[PDB]
Every structure is written in C-alpha cells, then in structure tokens.
Amino acid sequence: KECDNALRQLETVRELLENPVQPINDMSYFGCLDSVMENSKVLGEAMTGISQNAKNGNLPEFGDAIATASKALCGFTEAAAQAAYLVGVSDPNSQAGQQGLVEPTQFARANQAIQMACQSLGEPGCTQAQVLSAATIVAKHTSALCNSCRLASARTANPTAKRQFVQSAKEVANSTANLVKTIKALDGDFTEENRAQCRAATAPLLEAVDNLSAFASNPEFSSVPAQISPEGRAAMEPIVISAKTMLESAGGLIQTARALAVNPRDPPRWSVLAGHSRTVSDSIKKLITSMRDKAPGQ
C-alpha cells in the first residue's frame, strides 16, 4: 500500500529504464560498470541482512537492511539506464542528445520552497521554532541549487555558462549565509528589529535565485533527447530487460521479507524469498554480461 515507500521507490526507479533517450548522470561506461559491481556487493550484504534479521526478528536492523538494499537498487538502475543510453547513442545511425545542465522542475521546486520559507519567517504570526524550521527548508533547497550549479559548470564547456553558473551559486550561498546569520541573531534575541532585519535579508536571496532562474531558463542549457536508431534500441534491450527483472524480483524479495519479519515460521514464504534472491542474482549477472557484450567502441 501507500505505506511501502521502498516498493513505491522501486516503481519510481523503473521509470529510468522506460526510455533512456537522455543521460541521467555524468558516468562513463566504465563508471557504470564499476557502479554495477559495487552495488552488487552492497546489495548482497543487504539481502543477507534482510533474511538474517527476519529470522532473528531484529526489526530496526532489518529496516536498515531494506534501506541499504533500496539504495543499492537505485544505484544499479541509474548505472544500467545510463549504460543503456550510452549503448544507444553510440550506434552510427543514432544522433546524440544534450544533457540538461540543471533539472528545471527540481529547480522550480527549490525556488518555490525557498520563497514560502522566506514568506513564513517574514510573518508576525511565526514562532521562534517556526523560524528555525523555515531556515532548514531555505537551507535544504539553497544548497540543492548551489550543488546543481556546480554540476552545471562541470558539464558545460561554455565559457560564459561556467562562470555565471558558479557566480550565481556564490550569490545564493552568500545571501543565504547572511539570512541564516540574522536568523541566528533572532534566535539569540527574538524581537521586532531582528524579525524586520530577517525580512530584509530574504530580498537579496530571492533576487539571486530569480537571476539564476532567468539564466538557467536559456534554451541552450536545457536537455535535448537523443535520436536513437532501431539498431541502438535493439542493442540496449538486454540491459534494460535484465535491470527491469532485477527490480521486479527485488520488490518481490522486500515484500515477502516484511511478511517473514512479522511471521518467521513459514516455509513457503522462505522458499519465495529464496527464489526472488536467486532471480535477482541471475538478473545482475545477465545485466553485467549484457553490458560487456554490448560495450561501445566494438
């Protein structure tokens, strides 16, 4: 149900494999291969921990294990999807597509979140606690923006782009440092003066965010999907299918493992868990082999 965030996150993750027409990360094919391997090691550990703590009934350790497995599965899928894309575009008939310098939706979410938080801490009807929590929100999304700018500069070879992205990021970080400072003063002594000062301090941050927005909007910095040929599509299918099956069986493993955690004495569920684990292993092996066989440059 809506409760099972791990299962829902596996489903969300599967979307990466549905049509790899754009690069999802900055990994080379070598990077993808390394990632797959590392995440294999980590996933094995996790799956062992899941069984063990389901038997022993160690619910907190079990939960940590599910969280670990989930992370590894995310990492696997990102690597597999990226690898798929790289295999596709590498086909002679395929024309490559530009990686987006920033995620525009995630950017807009940061903008709106920062905005709401500033507006909150600006209010008269706002407790000391609420100002702090508002600040953690501002901080969360602000750092997200700066990090995205850092990546954007690394990605782009454009001279004005690299400079301005890093510059805008610096403005955001600076003015956020100024905001968090006056909020710390306000936390030291909660008074009208300090609250009005805080309402001022948001102006340069909002301006900085707005500037960065205008700059990032430029269609030169946006992503363009790849023209992937039927041959390229055929080449990447085994990787995609292996990755999908891996996710199916992993979801099955988690789902069954919860039931076993609440009721360990059930041989059928244990047999189902085993089957899921084995299909996961076989999917990972078939994925690795598929990535080797279809490795670009051949």
């Binding site: 702090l132 510059q167 610096k170 968090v180 400072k181």
Partner: peptide, 25 residues
C-alpha cells in the same frame, strides 16, 4: 560533537561559497 543546526548551516554555506569562489578564479 553536538552542534547547533544554524551553526552547521552557516558553516556549510560559508564553506560552499569559498569552494565556489575558488572553482573559477
């Protein structure tokens, strides 16, 4: 250590602003 959340935020952003400053020029 048990540090103040605001202290941690300020530290993070000063550090990041320095890093960005240095990254280009």
């Amino acid at each position: 250590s048990t540090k103040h959340i605001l202290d941690d935020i300020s530290t993070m952003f000063d550090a990041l602003a320095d890093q960005l400053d240095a990254m280009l020029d």
